[PDB]
Amino acid sequence: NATEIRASVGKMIDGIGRFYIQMCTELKLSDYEGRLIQNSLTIERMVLSAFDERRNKYLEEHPSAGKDPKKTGGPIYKRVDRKWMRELVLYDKEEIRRIWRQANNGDDATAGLTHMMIWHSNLNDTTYQRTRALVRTGMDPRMCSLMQGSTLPRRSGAAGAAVKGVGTMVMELIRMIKRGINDRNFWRGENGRKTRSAYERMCNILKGKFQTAAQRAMMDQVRESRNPGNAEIEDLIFLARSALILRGSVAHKSCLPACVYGSAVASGYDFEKEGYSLVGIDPFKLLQNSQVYSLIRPNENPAHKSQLVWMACNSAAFEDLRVLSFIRGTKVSPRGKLSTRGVQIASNENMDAMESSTLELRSRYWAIRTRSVQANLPFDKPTIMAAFTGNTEGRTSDMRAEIIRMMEGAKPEFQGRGVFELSDERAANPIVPSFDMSNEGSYFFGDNAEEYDNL
Amino acid sequence: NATEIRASVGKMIDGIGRFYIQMCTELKLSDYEGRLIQNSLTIERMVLSAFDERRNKYLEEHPSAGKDPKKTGGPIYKRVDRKWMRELVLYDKEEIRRIWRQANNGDDATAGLTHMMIWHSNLNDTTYQRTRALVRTGMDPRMCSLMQGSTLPRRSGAAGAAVKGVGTMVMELIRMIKRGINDRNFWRGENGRKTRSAYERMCNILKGKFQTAAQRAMMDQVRESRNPGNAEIEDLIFLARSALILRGSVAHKSCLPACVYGSAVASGYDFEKEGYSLVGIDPFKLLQNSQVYSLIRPNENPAHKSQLVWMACNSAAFEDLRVLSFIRGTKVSPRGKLSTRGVQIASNENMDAMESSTLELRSRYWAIRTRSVQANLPFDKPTIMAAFTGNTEGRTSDMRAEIIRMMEGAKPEFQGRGVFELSDERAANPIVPSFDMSNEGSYFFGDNAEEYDNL
Amino acid sequence: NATEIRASVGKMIDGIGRFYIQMCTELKLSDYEGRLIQNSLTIERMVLSAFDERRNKYLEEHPSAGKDPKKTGGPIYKRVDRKWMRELVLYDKEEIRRIWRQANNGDDATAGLTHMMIWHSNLNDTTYQRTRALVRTGMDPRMCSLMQGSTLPRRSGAAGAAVKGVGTMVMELIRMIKRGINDRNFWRGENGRKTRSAYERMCNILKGKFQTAAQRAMMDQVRESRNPGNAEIEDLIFLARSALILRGSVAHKSCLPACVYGSAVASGYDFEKEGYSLVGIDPFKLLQNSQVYSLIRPNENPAHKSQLVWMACNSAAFEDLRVLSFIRGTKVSPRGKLSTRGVQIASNENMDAMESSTLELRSRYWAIRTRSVQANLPFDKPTIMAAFTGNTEGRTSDMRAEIIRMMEGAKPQGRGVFELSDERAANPIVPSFDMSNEGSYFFGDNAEEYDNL
Ligand code: NA
């Protein structure tokens, strides 16, 4: 029955590929322009917008975007007369829906839509900073390593929860609890009932993330509080600090851009026959054989742009760079050292100086997510100081004292990688890694990237 | 009437040059020795000392320096027999005053004295750290980016105030308030009236720096407190933290050393005819055409010494390094990464190992200070954490809550730079910069420079 | 009489060498294998274990190690058939004691045992991080620069105490005071008298470290408290923060591995004739003439492994890297920038990928510890913030206010640098620092935690 899931997962990868090929024909893009990752993002955004229907389920629309809510589109980049031309294309949302379902043989393929949504979330996590959003909710900016999927749409329920990190959940809870503090009628009446049911659902999702009985117990107390306030906000802050040392269980999905899937179907490949699994070597096989191009701004390093895309494709922004450097075979530097900005090109950017280069998406080894010798690496001092702080004042409980005790005695042993040679297609001989101890361990060390809430 | 100001500003630049030429002839310096920036500083110090008359208005004299208060002087460096010789010269302050007024055609030229004072202030800001002075006044050492002109003399009135930053003002206020806490007779008597009038003047100067109505309002409350104490000190600390995010308006004057002005007049240049403006391209033109040399210690990078002087000449220590790197055309590294120390050579240093090199003071572009596409860059995490802290305990108010609300929701839209080609003398086509995002943004990131209070 | 101490110190250096030569012959190691620093560490551990007799005086034994407490040993590495072989050797502790005393001409040579113990402490200080142990005792992890000899054995006598830093002493006091808070029979009875006598001894040792009258006075109050608790713990935390700015006086002993001493005696050298002094040029002379090899893991920089050993040999982990870089002649990078791990090889590590390289232990200059132009360097911002914090709330006293005043107004352990050609210390060298280098060895530290094993 495990190969039956591989057939269904391959069936939707086939669907994303079939759709992207039709969109390239529809937009009349050359083979090079079809492999441009900037064009792939625009095509992906149109489907999520067409099926969203202003629900904020698959993406988040601009306030301007809601000027003609029956149409969707974005920038399409073409190479004309030795220069890069940008044009704003528009299609009817009903037309885009028709083409998407047509590529999936009449089906809706909600999973195919979700797949591209998580790929966008992984790209935003690897690209943009979230420290300003943490400060608004009264959080420590040093918890940036807990923000998995913090850019997901507001109403992406089932799909988003699996990818969201502990800090992302505490943020959506603190945001919601602070909204209750203002007006007392928030949690009362018919309207209140629905919001209370979502409150208990979010608390249970976050409870499932924690893998210690003490952390789960404190989340139970927060959920049972019929009228939450500043007391629960402080408990959630404390639980966020524990997540730094006593890490929660967060799922990482390796979602590639649509152009990769499309260019593999164009050659000739039946993902429904061969099957497909996001867990093992299948994503690495596609990236080794892939050919993706990207627009590049002046004073940008195309090797750093490649690391940005390669890391987002593997959902590795929150993993140890010393492990990523071993798998990649090249130093995976922290984000602050990257001479690059977002993959997307803003509308105010000038096209005259824009160039393109080949994205380097290959790896020396491949790895399977494992959540048997193990070498465990220490946390950096900012993580240690952010975790063991603020416990000298305020609320106290038997559960807080128990959690702090587990934090102090925290063992080296969670979301690991089993490294194998590319020639070892069947995962015969696991490779014991040999880390370069001079590289930084956190992708967010000295982070200087753009803030997400800028547009 | 705008060209009438250019003629008067050119008249004092002519005066500084005429004076420096006379001092080189007076001291019998070679053409190379006249272009040595160590000699330029000594000559500049003698004028500020001659007209100060122990007022602490243009400089700050050593306690030893007041052993013969009728004379002034310093180290003069000459190249004799393949080595650098240092000698201590002494002149009567009346003689130095006579030579200064003779070069300015009998005038006093107070503006010319101020100009060299601000140039010394900009050099000290770019060179020395002030974290120990911040700790003495109970401040956050991470507010080092608010210490513009923190080395200006205490009794430098109107001219110095325009250059002083928000943190410099909070320091001089807290220093003054703590002396009021100690002695109860402070605000009483003739001294009390004067010191209270200076207190209200400093509060209004700092109030003018802030560009939000809420910040100005809190400064009014601090001024109206007829007997200030620890309550106002805590308000001033909070306002300093707000200045990190809601930046004040501080004036930056590009003041070049006297040797540059002197070497331009020596060739033949009438700054009174052509005019001169510190705002536009005139300082960049002088630096492009300039030829300045500097003594250099062992294990010092002459390129890093050049960045130190070039940054001080443009008063850019408190600006974004990614903008300075674009204008300079070369990476403008943070101060911690500079393999250099102060420009001045201490009296205890050994001359045998001393060498000299050519200062690289040229730039790829020039820029005019503007206080129209704009790309806004995030603050580093130490700035964010220093700004949003300490507000959980202690004082709360309608004004404090309003300021924090503006800080949390602060938009990126704080003085910018307008970049132009050197071939674009009339500022026709503005250049949209392309930053290298791998460079650090703060000149004080990982700061390791000497403390200013050591001598 | 100063040359009489040089003769006795040379007498024990000769003993360590005589012993190591006998151990190489006993273990049948080649000349190369005798110069492998991994073999030297194993040999050194066997002597400390044989004479310890489970006292925790010279080392700290593993719980497994106490499965046959009459024997001792460790991993010995040999080069067989182009590969590195590891074998676990075992010897009777009485046999190792007999071989050690025979090399010192029948004497016990406790100083020689202490010498290798301090060398192990210096290596652990330069290698492993102690931030997790700091958090357990409620301390600031930024006080890592105060942890000299924090890995020394529990019952290490006078010699070990002298090497311990201020933060190491506050840790052993807070640990002990927290044990008194829990159980009250602690300060009562025969145990109570002894444990109280050790408490007053530790307080006086730490009092001697401080070199300001105010800091010494606050330690007196901590000692006189007949029943200490959380009040003294907070006083000790405050005194540790003062040590960041008002540094204490801690002794640093340059102890080289036994293979260095052994390889110098093998050639032929009478340390008892020439004498030996850990203070001056003698350790630098040995390192200049030394030839030491080290096993090296994949993706490790042998130049960084060399810096690790050279720094531990000079007990320099807690000194300014800008001074160490001037003496070394090469940039001495912070520990976070080093592409290396511990010198020792764990039992779970695979020998197939292991290689060896030559340790670069030479220096451009030598220096004598001096505790006359002086150039003083600023503290980094984490040190400043860790020192001036927590004084807004809690306990207050005339002594705390006096110490903070001395900290805020504090004016600027030195090194006197000389050329290698200047053996008689004629011309002191005024250093010329590279101001781009980081000043603290622990800046951005990413090394393994000492307690994990
Ligand atoms: Na970056």
PDB file of N, CA and C in Angstrom, chain A residues 129 131-132 135-136 140-142 144 178 298-300 304 335-341 348 393 444-451 454, chain B residues 245 322 326 337 373-376 378-381 384-385 388 393 406-412 434-441 445:
ATOM      1  N   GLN A 129      13.076  38.018   6.574  1.00  0.00           N
ATOM      2  CA  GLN A 129      13.182  38.062   8.024  1.00  0.00           C
ATOM      3  C   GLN A 129      11.820  38.356   8.640  1.00  0.00           C
ATOM      4  N   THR A 131      11.614  39.436  12.195  1.00  0.00           N
ATOM      5  CA  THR A 131      11.871  39.960  13.533  1.00  0.00           C
ATOM      6  C   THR A 131      10.888  41.059  13.914  1.00  0.00           C
ATOM      7  N   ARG A 132      10.430  41.852  12.942  1.00  0.00           N
ATOM      8  CA  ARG A 132       9.475  42.911  13.251  1.00  0.00           C
ATOM      9  C   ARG A 132       8.123  42.335  13.653  1.00  0.00           C
ATOM     10  N   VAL A 135       8.379  41.273  17.282  1.00  0.00           N
ATOM     11  CA  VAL A 135       8.347  42.361  18.252  1.00  0.00           C
ATOM     12  C   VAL A 135       6.918  42.845  18.466  1.00  0.00           C
ATOM     13  N   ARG A 136       6.111  42.873  17.400  1.00  0.00           N
ATOM     14  CA  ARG A 136       4.723  43.308  17.531  1.00  0.00           C
ATOM     15  C   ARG A 136       3.958  42.429  18.511  1.00  0.00           C
ATOM     16  N   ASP A 140      10.754  37.494  21.553  1.00  0.00           N
ATOM     17  CA  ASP A 140      12.194  37.655  21.389  1.00  0.00           C
ATOM     18  C   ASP A 140      12.565  37.487  19.918  1.00  0.00           C
ATOM     19  N   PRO A 141      13.258  38.456  19.316  1.00  0.00           N
ATOM     20  CA  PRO A 141      13.669  38.299  17.910  1.00  0.00           C
ATOM     21  C   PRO A 141      14.610  37.133  17.676  1.00  0.00           C
ATOM     22  N   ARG A 142      15.264  36.622  18.719  1.00  0.00           N
ATOM     23  CA  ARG A 142      16.185  35.503  18.580  1.00  0.00           C
ATOM     24  C   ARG A 142      15.477  34.170  18.382  1.00  0.00           C
ATOM     25  N   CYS A 144      13.877  33.459  15.782  1.00  0.00           N
ATOM     26  CA  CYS A 144      13.682  33.397  14.338  1.00  0.00           C
ATOM     27  C   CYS A 144      13.788  31.979  13.793  1.00  0.00           C
ATOM     28  N   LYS A 178      -4.481  38.673  22.048  1.00  0.00           N
ATOM     29  CA  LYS A 178      -4.419  40.122  22.219  1.00  0.00           C
ATOM     30  C   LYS A 178      -5.627  40.807  21.599  1.00  0.00           C
ATOM     31  N   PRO A 298      22.103  43.508 -10.424  1.00  0.00           N
ATOM     32  CA  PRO A 298      23.503  43.921 -10.289  1.00  0.00           C
ATOM     33  C   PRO A 298      23.999  43.747  -8.861  1.00  0.00           C
ATOM     34  N   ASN A 299      25.293  43.446  -8.742  1.00  0.00           N
ATOM     35  CA  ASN A 299      25.960  43.244  -7.454  1.00  0.00           C
ATOM     36  C   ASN A 299      25.353  42.084  -6.669  1.00  0.00           C
ATOM     37  N   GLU A 300      24.860  41.067  -7.372  1.00  0.00           N
ATOM     38  CA  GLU A 300      24.355  39.852  -6.751  1.00  0.00           C
ATOM     39  C   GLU A 300      25.192  38.661  -7.196  1.00  0.00           C
ATOM     40  N   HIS A 304      25.075  32.577  -4.727  1.00  0.00           N
ATOM     41  CA  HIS A 304      24.265  32.785  -3.533  1.00  0.00           C
ATOM     42  C   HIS A 304      22.778  32.721  -3.856  1.00  0.00           C
ATOM     43  N   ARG A 335      22.573  33.409   5.993  1.00  0.00           N
ATOM     44  CA  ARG A 335      21.840  34.322   5.127  1.00  0.00           C
ATOM     45  C   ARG A 335      22.471  35.709   5.087  1.00  0.00           C
ATOM     46  N   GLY A 336      23.061  36.155   6.199  1.00  0.00           N
ATOM     47  CA  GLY A 336      23.683  37.468   6.224  1.00  0.00           C
ATOM     48  C   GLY A 336      24.846  37.608   5.263  1.00  0.00           C
ATOM     49  N   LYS A 337      25.547  36.512   4.984  1.00  0.00           N
ATOM     50  CA  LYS A 337      26.689  36.520   4.080  1.00  0.00           C
ATOM     51  C   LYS A 337      26.287  36.367   2.621  1.00  0.00           C
ATOM     52  N   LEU A 338      24.995  36.228   2.334  1.00  0.00           N
ATOM     53  CA  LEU A 338      24.542  36.029   0.965  1.00  0.00           C
ATOM     54  C   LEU A 338      24.425  37.365   0.242  1.00  0.00           C
ATOM     55  N   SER A 339      25.060  37.460  -0.926  1.00  0.00           N
ATOM     56  CA  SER A 339      24.943  38.644  -1.774  1.00  0.00           C
ATOM     57  C   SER A 339      23.752  38.484  -2.716  1.00  0.00           C
ATOM     58  N   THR A 340      22.568  38.416  -2.118  1.00  0.00           N
ATOM     59  CA  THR A 340      21.358  38.250  -2.907  1.00  0.00           C
ATOM     60  C   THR A 340      20.168  38.765  -2.116  1.00  0.00           C
ATOM     61  N   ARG A 341      19.089  39.032  -2.848  1.00  0.00           N
ATOM     62  CA  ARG A 341      17.806  39.403  -2.270  1.00  0.00           C
ATOM     63  C   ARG A 341      16.737  38.429  -2.754  1.00  0.00           C
ATOM     64  N   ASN A 348       8.694  47.984  -9.050  1.00  0.00           N
ATOM     65  CA  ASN A 348       9.436  49.235  -9.148  1.00  0.00           C
ATOM     66  C   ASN A 348      10.878  49.039  -9.599  1.00  0.00           C
ATOM     67  N   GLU A 393      11.200  36.329  37.029  1.00  0.00           N
ATOM     68  CA  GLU A 393      10.099  37.181  37.454  1.00  0.00           C
ATOM     69  C   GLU A 393       8.800  36.700  36.825  1.00  0.00           C
ATOM     70  N   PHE A 444      20.330  31.860  10.370  1.00  0.00           N
ATOM     71  CA  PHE A 444      19.890  33.182  10.792  1.00  0.00           C
ATOM     72  C   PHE A 444      20.932  33.932  11.614  1.00  0.00           C
ATOM     73  N   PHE A 445      22.147  33.400  11.735  1.00  0.00           N
ATOM     74  CA  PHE A 445      23.197  34.115  12.446  1.00  0.00           C
ATOM     75  C   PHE A 445      23.561  35.399  11.711  1.00  0.00           C
ATOM     76  N   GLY A 446      23.519  36.518  12.430  1.00  0.00           N
ATOM     77  CA  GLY A 446      23.786  37.812  11.822  1.00  0.00           C
ATOM     78  C   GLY A 446      22.865  38.129  10.665  1.00  0.00           C
ATOM     79  N   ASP A 447      21.590  37.761  10.783  1.00  0.00           N
ATOM     80  CA  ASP A 447      20.655  37.926   9.679  1.00  0.00           C
ATOM     81  C   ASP A 447      20.478  39.402   9.347  1.00  0.00           C
ATOM     82  N   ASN A 448      20.538  39.718   8.049  1.00  0.00           N
ATOM     83  CA  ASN A 448      20.345  41.080   7.565  1.00  0.00           C
ATOM     84  C   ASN A 448      19.387  41.131   6.381  1.00  0.00           C
ATOM     85  N   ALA A 449      18.536  40.120   6.226  1.00  0.00           N
ATOM     86  CA  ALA A 449      17.634  40.060   5.090  1.00  0.00           C
ATOM     87  C   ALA A 449      16.464  41.018   5.266  1.00  0.00           C
ATOM     88  N   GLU A 450      15.760  41.233   4.162  1.00  0.00           N
ATOM     89  CA  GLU A 450      14.615  42.126   4.127  1.00  0.00           C
ATOM     90  C   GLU A 450      13.521  41.631   5.064  1.00  0.00           C
ATOM     91  N   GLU A 451      12.682  42.563   5.507  1.00  0.00           N
ATOM     92  CA  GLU A 451      11.543  42.203   6.335  1.00  0.00           C
ATOM     93  C   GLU A 451      10.383  41.789   5.445  1.00  0.00           C
ATOM     94  N   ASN A 454       7.124  44.027   4.042  1.00  0.00           N
ATOM     95  CA  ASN A 454       7.386  45.167   3.170  1.00  0.00           C
ATOM     96  C   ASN A 454       6.919  44.853   1.753  1.00  0.00           C
TER      97      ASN A 454
ATOM     98  N   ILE B 245      14.752  53.365  16.425  1.00  0.00           N
ATOM     99  CA  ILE B 245      13.780  53.078  15.373  1.00  0.00           C
ATOM    100  C   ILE B 245      13.218  54.358  14.759  1.00  0.00           C
ATOM    101  N   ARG B 322      26.312  49.823   3.374  1.00  0.00           N
ATOM    102  CA  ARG B 322      25.967  49.342   2.041  1.00  0.00           C
ATOM    103  C   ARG B 322      25.754  50.494   1.066  1.00  0.00           C
ATOM    104  N   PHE B 326      28.575  51.497  -2.098  1.00  0.00           N
ATOM    105  CA  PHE B 326      28.167  51.779  -3.469  1.00  0.00           C
ATOM    106  C   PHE B 326      28.754  53.097  -3.965  1.00  0.00           C
ATOM    107  N   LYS B 337      36.508  45.429  11.559  1.00  0.00           N
ATOM    108  CA  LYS B 337      37.333  44.760  10.564  1.00  0.00           C
ATOM    109  C   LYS B 337      38.481  45.623  10.054  1.00  0.00           C
ATOM    110  N   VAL B 373      12.502  56.404  -6.428  1.00  0.00           N
ATOM    111  CA  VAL B 373      12.379  55.088  -5.816  1.00  0.00           C
ATOM    112  C   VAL B 373      13.333  54.983  -4.635  1.00  0.00           C
ATOM    113  N   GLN B 374      12.852  54.392  -3.542  1.00  0.00           N
ATOM    114  CA  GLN B 374      13.636  54.226  -2.326  1.00  0.00           C
ATOM    115  C   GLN B 374      13.569  52.773  -1.887  1.00  0.00           C
ATOM    116  N   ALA B 375      14.730  52.182  -1.620  1.00  0.00           N
ATOM    117  CA  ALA B 375      14.831  50.819  -1.116  1.00  0.00           C
ATOM    118  C   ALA B 375      15.302  50.875   0.330  1.00  0.00           C
ATOM    119  N   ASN B 376      14.457  50.416   1.247  1.00  0.00           N
ATOM    120  CA  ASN B 376      14.732  50.483   2.675  1.00  0.00           C
ATOM    121  C   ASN B 376      15.073  49.099   3.204  1.00  0.00           C
ATOM    122  N   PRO B 378      16.698  46.654   6.588  1.00  0.00           N
ATOM    123  CA  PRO B 378      16.306  46.404   7.976  1.00  0.00           C
ATOM    124  C   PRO B 378      17.427  46.711   8.957  1.00  0.00           C
ATOM    125  N   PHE B 379      17.022  46.952  10.201  1.00  0.00           N
ATOM    126  CA  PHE B 379      17.972  47.095  11.291  1.00  0.00           C
ATOM    127  C   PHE B 379      18.518  45.728  11.691  1.00  0.00           C
ATOM    128  N   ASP B 380      19.717  45.728  12.265  1.00  0.00           N
ATOM    129  CA  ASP B 380      20.258  44.492  12.806  1.00  0.00           C
ATOM    130  C   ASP B 380      19.557  44.133  14.115  1.00  0.00           C
ATOM    131  N   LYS B 381      19.653  42.856  14.483  1.00  0.00           N
ATOM    132  CA  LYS B 381      18.979  42.382  15.689  1.00  0.00           C
ATOM    133  C   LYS B 381      19.429  43.085  16.967  1.00  0.00           C
ATOM    134  N   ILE B 384      17.299  46.164  17.238  1.00  0.00           N
ATOM    135  CA  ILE B 384      15.905  45.854  17.543  1.00  0.00           C
ATOM    136  C   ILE B 384      15.748  45.504  19.017  1.00  0.00           C
ATOM    137  N   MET B 385      16.665  44.693  19.551  1.00  0.00           N
ATOM    138  CA  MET B 385      16.563  44.271  20.944  1.00  0.00           C
ATOM    139  C   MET B 385      16.847  45.417  21.907  1.00  0.00           C
ATOM    140  N   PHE B 388      13.450  47.668  21.837  1.00  0.00           N
ATOM    141  CA  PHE B 388      12.257  47.095  22.457  1.00  0.00           C
ATOM    142  C   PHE B 388      12.671  46.309  23.700  1.00  0.00           C
ATOM    143  N   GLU B 393       8.722  46.980  32.831  1.00  0.00           N
ATOM    144  CA  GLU B 393       8.781  47.322  34.242  1.00  0.00           C
ATOM    145  C   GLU B 393       9.068  48.807  34.360  1.00  0.00           C
ATOM    146  N   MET B 406       4.017  53.516  17.813  1.00  0.00           N
ATOM    147  CA  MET B 406       4.660  53.979  16.589  1.00  0.00           C
ATOM    148  C   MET B 406       5.916  53.178  16.277  1.00  0.00           C
ATOM    149  N   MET B 407       6.633  52.714  17.303  1.00  0.00           N
ATOM    150  CA  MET B 407       7.843  51.930  17.070  1.00  0.00           C
ATOM    151  C   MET B 407       7.510  50.561  16.488  1.00  0.00           C
ATOM    152  N   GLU B 408       6.522  49.873  17.069  1.00  0.00           N
ATOM    153  CA  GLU B 408       6.164  48.541  16.587  1.00  0.00           C
ATOM    154  C   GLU B 408       5.629  48.593  15.161  1.00  0.00           C
ATOM    155  N   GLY B 409       4.771  49.564  14.867  1.00  0.00           N
ATOM    156  CA  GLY B 409       4.200  49.732  13.549  1.00  0.00           C
ATOM    157  C   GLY B 409       4.971  50.672  12.655  1.00  0.00           C
ATOM    158  N   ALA B 410       6.200  51.013  13.037  1.00  0.00           N
ATOM    159  CA  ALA B 410       7.001  51.956  12.269  1.00  0.00           C
ATOM    160  C   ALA B 410       7.230  51.452  10.853  1.00  0.00           C
ATOM    161  N   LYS B 411       6.926  52.300   9.883  1.00  0.00           N
ATOM    162  CA  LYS B 411       7.168  51.963   8.497  1.00  0.00           C
ATOM    163  C   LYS B 411       8.624  52.272   8.171  1.00  0.00           C
ATOM    164  N   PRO B 412       9.166  51.695   7.096  1.00  0.00           N
ATOM    165  CA  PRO B 412      10.551  52.036   6.734  1.00  0.00           C
ATOM    166  C   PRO B 412      10.729  53.503   6.385  1.00  0.00           C
ATOM    167  N   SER B 434      22.563  49.814  -6.219  1.00  0.00           N
ATOM    168  CA  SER B 434      22.456  48.355  -6.184  1.00  0.00           C
ATOM    169  C   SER B 434      23.394  47.860  -5.089  1.00  0.00           C
ATOM    170  N   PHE B 435      22.836  47.584  -3.914  1.00  0.00           N
ATOM    171  CA  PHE B 435      23.632  47.261  -2.740  1.00  0.00           C
ATOM    172  C   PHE B 435      24.131  45.822  -2.785  1.00  0.00           C
ATOM    173  N   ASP B 436      25.271  45.596  -2.136  1.00  0.00           N
ATOM    174  CA  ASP B 436      25.780  44.252  -1.879  1.00  0.00           C
ATOM    175  C   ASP B 436      25.236  43.804  -0.526  1.00  0.00           C
ATOM    176  N   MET B 437      24.255  42.903  -0.546  1.00  0.00           N
ATOM    177  CA  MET B 437      23.561  42.515   0.679  1.00  0.00           C
ATOM    178  C   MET B 437      24.397  41.647   1.609  1.00  0.00           C
ATOM    179  N   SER B 438      25.607  41.247   1.216  1.00  0.00           N
ATOM    180  CA  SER B 438      26.459  40.495   2.127  1.00  0.00           C
ATOM    181  C   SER B 438      27.239  41.399   3.067  1.00  0.00           C
ATOM    182  N   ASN B 439      27.379  42.679   2.731  1.00  0.00           N
ATOM    183  CA  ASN B 439      28.086  43.609   3.596  1.00  0.00           C
ATOM    184  C   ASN B 439      27.251  43.920   4.830  1.00  0.00           C
ATOM    185  N   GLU B 440      27.935  44.182   5.937  1.00  0.00           N
ATOM    186  CA  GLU B 440      27.246  44.604   7.145  1.00  0.00           C
ATOM    187  C   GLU B 440      26.729  46.029   6.985  1.00  0.00           C
ATOM    188  N   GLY B 441      25.631  46.326   7.672  1.00  0.00           N
ATOM    189  CA  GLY B 441      24.973  47.603   7.488  1.00  0.00           C
ATOM    190  C   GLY B 441      25.402  48.686   8.456  1.00  0.00           C
ATOM    191  N   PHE B 445      29.045  47.457  13.997  1.00  0.00           N
ATOM    192  CA  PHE B 445      28.821  46.032  14.199  1.00  0.00           C
ATOM    193  C   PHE B 445      30.140  45.351  14.553  1.00  0.00           C
TER     194      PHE B 445
END
